[PDB]
């Protein structure tokens, strides 16, 4: 709460550590699911992607390459122009786009339209025959909400999107129809075509890199590939150029992702947009694979491929210039970095149930269901702990005073109790602790037993007494309400949560069971509280 | 070049400052291509597009939302399990992806399908997550979109940058549409806020939650286009139907908020033509600063000895004071001699009256707004000299280095003696000065000039013997 | 609200435009300061200052240079070193590191201190004139709860804080010494002793930044000068150097912040560190300058400073190779950057009362106080609204159902009326809205004269009845716990907030005035709520 | 080399492959200093203490705390006016600030002091907003401090840098510093963490709410060191007492967390010595790859004409065959003239019994663990050859160009014939090979060590008349 700076200052003035003491009125009484872990602040986070994706950008530019956007539909006789007559052996695993065409009111589909009862359905409307026509002429998605909204009354789409299902059954036969335009499988082929605009008006050397995503077909398999990728490649635009520059570029470019030695190879596919034997395989080892769940235990593994751009396919453009490229596969230097064994998992991890909360974040989750509602319940439940906290060995039965007050306007004094006898005033489990660990929530008691998981897991810092004091806390506020007089709530044995007021929110429950987690709280509580409010 | 540290040090115990002036000893002498501004360090230069695309993973981050890759190709089924009865509308405006039939020609279309909008793969990342972990779910995620509207490239491209963000809670308003609008956009500049009713009232989100954000930037009141207002309508949001989640088993409500990327890219750098900023190596849009023709502009033929810096650096040492007396007449400016034999350097206008050098010697190369001039240093010319970057080669200076390394040709090839002579200036050559073929096509490109002229009148003769 | 997947499923499959308009069902039905801009999300933000220093840093690394980290507190011999005999001239603009010493418990304070009565106040304890001497040998801060609460008992520092003040009147003695410590005045000074230790073991060229804090003196004045600042530094080592490379660096740096051209002069300074004729000043033109409150409306302004190392210098820490140093003051180029006139004003903005909340943030703060609390009171609200926003010109006096319905379980029936004659029902500045306009509350209705405001400011959504509607809403509800039968809640002119349920917090209050702010809400709402609760 | 489009287009029609193969004419010719790895590009790198900082700022922002920067320099009477009571025994930890007297020698001290801790500061920055802003107030910063803890430098240093950050509400518990903590510390891998009320009880805390934040990090689980068990203190924090709030008008509470980033930087780029890592350019720390190693290691001279290349790249490609047969015995390898007179190359062990090239013609260069070793290419030595950078210059490769070029030497002064001999390799200049003589004075630093040894024994004669 806010205090008086003149007060506070005037009374530690002459007498300090009177005020001091005295401070501790400022702070808050903060409830049950006030405290920490209860309570918490929450941040974003990146995905591995498009952390490595950003890195990748840095990596770059802090080696003199400037970015660019280049093409990505492109017309297939860019390829045919990169690969001569090798050509279709690329296009099989390219992607063509198709789309769908608008529906043939003309011709075909007119002359037997007009020999049946064309409309039936009463809509009247002058002969719209033009509004359908500039459809087969030129029309969208946002168009709907004026033939209709605007035409035949009827707002927006609440008779158009059945109008157009039971009179028109025709929509209902639309085929997607193939193209030449095509999706990059790799970035060089939109190199040409940019490169084509700037290879001679700019100063040498041309330093021009981009990270942008390709398309590629490879046995429809999420596992042996992916449709979609992403490529952080670059071109080298000068007038001397040799393999020795690829190299170079992937130098610099790996060690700024830890790798520390290269070793490049020469690649057998000897493609045609590359200068026979230039295009070079480079391989680097990097320190985070030594040893590993995978098949890089030396530590070293491919990650980039590179070669000068045939003489030939840059003449199709008119680059007078050779040029140099290097194309770095993002996915997998990310899976290196991020620690990811899985392409798919990584990527898109929410879809293959990658999912998981920490220990902390459960512990978080487990909220106390019946909660007090005035300062002086806070304070019976905080007092039925101390009376039933200390007395916890009295050979039952046996009161035991434990508030002394007025609630709500009314005379309340609430006793720990027990009924039976040979036993002890609480149950031996009434000084358990609900402790997340290993991703199972217990009701365990403090244990050279249990070490393990009080060190390990994250404590929630409520004990079955702890959590039921909040429970009886509540039940004699109640009867303030109903100006009752006698209130003897009771709880015997533990099998859930439920039974400790414990409790936590459907998502979070259906998460450990996903996750094939556990809860394990049961135990003899034992322990009721007669209330007695006049 | 490397010293030596007690040599100085002790150097400086007697006379400290004739020790200290000692120093200028260690600087190198600098050839005339190798000084500033013939050289510099140059450094990488990222795209407004992407600039803009991190900078909004960033803006996202910082109110919360935790990133995620969504599914890009994906079956029509889903926008017709979203859309309801309007699918179809939209199927419309989407691609399809076809592929070639392996002869054991012609694409073979697909059930397959470009995502036109994020939405597309939302409903399927939220699919698996919406009831496992704890609410609010805030994700986002800036990724490649591909629209067929009209297929066009002017007004539009046929893909875009979506940024994103999904909301779910157990109880959602168009508010936190709204928020999350007003937090996302003002780290950007964005100070007033205005939301209105899409009427388009898309399928898929419940009837009258789509919403148009219309956010005010100071940087645009009086921008060359209709924002000048200030506002523009800069992204759009709604709240997923039940219909939709339904059918992904989502059973929480989902705030969806979309921002329009290259849009934002362009009011941030403010280009007009998205194309233009999206695409400018294309677009012919490529510029090369000033300074950078500069650096550009070199010296071709150089003194390759020692002592020939130090002659053409005479050279002009003269022409820099005797430009006046009536010629003819001559004057002497170097003696000494180089690889073998001594020499001497003379400099003359044999021709009848008039001065020694021609009124030009004096004229300086400098560039600006583009164009490559040759001009004196005259208070006419100022803001030339004031706004451009002066190459800080002169006429003579141009001139000298042709002479200092033309007699030293003549210094290896035995000879006696040469006569280096000089008019006119028709253009650089003429002035022993060059620019790479690249930046030439580039000026003209730019379609920028070159007004390199000049009477110099200038000869030097010089004889070995 | 959470909804049924199947149902909403099952039921779209048949009826679709039937779930659709269901949909709102799930929607959330938010009370008053439930609703934008009375919600909102908040996102930290950085100090142009410290931005500076990473767009700074970036900038460096992308040059080749890489960070590291110098001497900040030096020995002003290696001043000494650096200037030989001009050094003088410069420790007196530097601050040296003083340091209070250690309370002489013996000879000159012994003497006198054996011939008194040692000690009155009952303490006891055996002798320890060793533990108070283990501090005239080597003590410190977190000692204090050593000879205390566990030396002469008394918890921590509840009897050690005035022991020490009253029976110990020495401390108050203790004077700061000076030493030859100083807090070096540019990077400079630190870069010998690095460079030190590396200029001949690395391989050149060498190139070395770091952007660190530098202390000054300059006239005590927060205006002319700070006596911290920072100074982005670099170092080129190399066998050959020319002023060249302190331009080509210059620039590079310079041209990543906007910067188009560059002119340098030589310092007329001429300092010792630097070789005669290479202290050069750097001059940079930057648009955002072309024209300002400023004195360099031509855009023109001198960002950097750098030279070459006297080899004199660099003997005296053995360095053979000569080196280049360039030192861009940051504060400045922050400024232009940030587009701020003072640098006081920009890096420390907090004090020089440089606050500022936005129109929407102040839009934001203005809650309402009386607002309902169950379902029914805010229908009861709502419906006020309706009959007194439709009837608002009935020549009263003249009753209006607004509400017929049962509210905690007893009939309720609230009417809107007016007492008086030849007026109208409602005021005439009942609909009138709060506009957060230039930093002034304002309640005004909408015109063709407050154009400007609700086109420029930013409207908070509630009007007069808006907000007393809710007050009404509240005191209904109150008597359905009072189980009175008749309240008749009224409300005359308004001339604050108050008079209208609107309020905001007393910190929001504050910031209006200091802001020489104002708030306008006045005029004749007046509309009564007669309520009949049975 | 620039090509021509069209000639290449053309030449394409015909035979593709026959041009294809052409391309490889466009492909620069490299010398031995221009191929990799004597040639690659570098960059600058961070320092883990920066790189830190900047990664806690983000870490702040990320949470909500807005950025600000809090007065360094400051008058005692603040410490005085926070401590209370207990600000003497605060101010013998900090320093103060001293000037020299203008003598119109001897510093005379002053009231100034430089913070021990960004609490001193935060009061004065909080002192002007926290009755004008709207709660809750969220500011942080992360800068320097100056503590003088026993004057150390072993254990701790004069300044380190502090990552603080405040938060002003009208109630605060102790847990919105638990909260802080661990939201703040999470970004960085610490999973899970542990609080403990603090004894030391400064006086400028609420009695019994400074604590000490204790996290654990997989990242140390098994350390060198304490920190094995995972945990270590890493951060403390408390809540304003009234008794100093009040000190500066602050009416609301205030929590304040404190974070010791050198720490942090050293857990997460896992240095040991504080300062070895903040200051290792003086503590010896300085480190090479091999692969740099490997770079600096070039050919000393080597062939200055187009022909002399393809001779020593003759030289060699007979040796690499003839290096057996029983000498003496000599081999003819180059055929052709250079400059204007023809010229051959003899290669022969003029020695009686023996082979032609001593056994170590093929000994290949390779950097390995900070050496330069002179090894064959052996299936024992694999390991240095398949973890260590092969310079790829073998002996033979390393003389050849020796002789190319010596023979370059005679073919311009007129001689007739030259004999270049060589038997043991001592070392790299044996084998004409070099480093910068401060990659030298390095390897010798980082106590490596070069064994380029060898029994080369090869002797080349060539005859130009």
Redesign the interface.
């Not at 001679?200 to 040498?204: A, G, M, Q, V």
């Given at each position: 709460?806010?205090?008086?700076?003149?007060?506070?200052?005037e009374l530690?003035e002459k007498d300090?550590?009177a005020?001091?003491?005295?401070?501790?009125?400022?702070?808050?009484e903060?409830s049950p699911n006030?405290?920490?872990?209860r309570?918490?602040?929450?941040?974003?986070?990146?995905?591995p992607?498009?952390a490595t994706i950003?890195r990748l950008?840095?990596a770059?530019?802090?080696?003199?390459?400037?970015?660019?956007?280049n093409?990505?539909?492109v017309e297939d006789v860019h390829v045919k122009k990169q690969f001569?007559?090798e050509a279709l052996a690329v296009?099989?695993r390219?992607?063509?786009?198709?789309?769908?065409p608008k529906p043939n009111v003309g011709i075909s589909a007119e002359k037997i339209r007009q020999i049946e009862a064309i409309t039936k359905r009463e809509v009247d409307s002058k002969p719209l025959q033009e509004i359908f026509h500039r459809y087969k002429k030129?029309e969208?998605?946002?168009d709907?909400?004026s033939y209709l909204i605007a035409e035949v009354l009827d707002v927006?789409?609440?008779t158009a999107?059945?109008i157009?299902?039971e009179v028109f059954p025709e929509?209902?036969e639309?085929?997607?129809?193939?193209?030449t335009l095509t999706?990059r499988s790799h970035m060089t082929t939109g190199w040409f075509?940019?490169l084509s605009?700037?290879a001679?008006?700019?100063?040498?050397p041309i330093?021009l890199?981009?990270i942008d995503?390709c398309?590629r077909?490879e046995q429809g398999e999420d596992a042996t590939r992916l449709?979609?990728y992403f490529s952080a490649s670059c071109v080298l635009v000068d007038?001397?150029?040799?393999?020795?520059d690829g190299?170079?570029?992937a130098?610099?470019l790996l060690?700024?992702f830890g790798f520390?030695?290269?070793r490049f190879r020469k690649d057998e596919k000897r493609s045609?947009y590359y200068?026979?034997?230039?295009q070079t395989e480079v391989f680097a080892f990097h320190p985070k694979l030594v040893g590993s769940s995978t098949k890089y235990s030396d530590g070293w593994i491919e990650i980039a491929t590179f070669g000068?751009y045939?003489?030939?396919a840059?003449?199709?453009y008119?680059?007078?210039?050779?040029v140099m490229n290097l194309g770095l596969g993002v996915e997998r230097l990310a899976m290196i970095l991020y620690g990811y064994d899985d392409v798919r998992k990584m990527?898109?991890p929410?879809?293959h149930?990658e999912?998981k909360?920490?220990?902390?974040?459960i512990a978080r989750?487990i909220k106390v269901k019946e909660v007090p509602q005035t300062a002086v319940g806070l304070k019976i439940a905080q007092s039925i702990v101390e009376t039933a906290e200390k007395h916890a060995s009295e050979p039952s039965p046996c009161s035991f005073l434990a508030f002394e007050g007025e609630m709500m306007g009314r005379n309340v004094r609430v006793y720990v109790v027990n009924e039976n006898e040979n036993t002890k005033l609480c149950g031996p489990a009434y000084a358990n602790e609900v402790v997340v660990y290993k991703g199972d929530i217990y009701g365990i008691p403090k244990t050279k037993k249990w070490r393990s998981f009080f060190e390990?897991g994250?404590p929630t810092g409520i004990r079955y007494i702890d959590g039921f004091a909040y429970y009886a806390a509540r039940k004699v506020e109640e009867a303030a309400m109903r100006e009752q007089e006698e209130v003897k709530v009771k709880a015997r044995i533990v099998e859930n949560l439920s039974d400790i007021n414990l409790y936590i929110?459907?998502?979070?429950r259906?998460?450990i069971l996903?996750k094939k987690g556990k809860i394990d709280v049961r135990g003899p509580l034992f322990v009721t509280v007669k209330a007695e409010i006049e």
């Open positions: 709460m806010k205090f008086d700076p003149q007060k506070y200052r530690a300090f550590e005020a001091w003491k005295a401070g501790k009125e400022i702070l808050a903060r006030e405290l920490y872990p309570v918490g602040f929450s941040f974003g986070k990146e995905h992607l498009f950003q950008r840095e770059y530019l802090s080696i003199g390459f400037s970015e660019v956007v093409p990505l539909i001569g007559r296009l099989d390219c992607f063509y786009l198709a789309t769908l030129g969208i998605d946002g709907d909400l927006d789409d609440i999107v059945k157009l299902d929509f209902k639309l085929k997607p129809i193939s193209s999706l075509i940019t605009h700037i001679d008006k700019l100063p040498l330093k890199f981009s995503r398309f077909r449709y979609t007038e001397e150029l040799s393999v020795d190299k170079a570029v130098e610099a060690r700024q520390e030695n290269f045609k200068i026979p034997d230039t000068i045939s003489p030939t840059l003449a199709e008119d680059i007078p210039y050779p990527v898109y929410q879809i149930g999912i909360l920490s220990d902390l974040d989750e390990e994250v929110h459907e998502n979070v259906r998460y996903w």
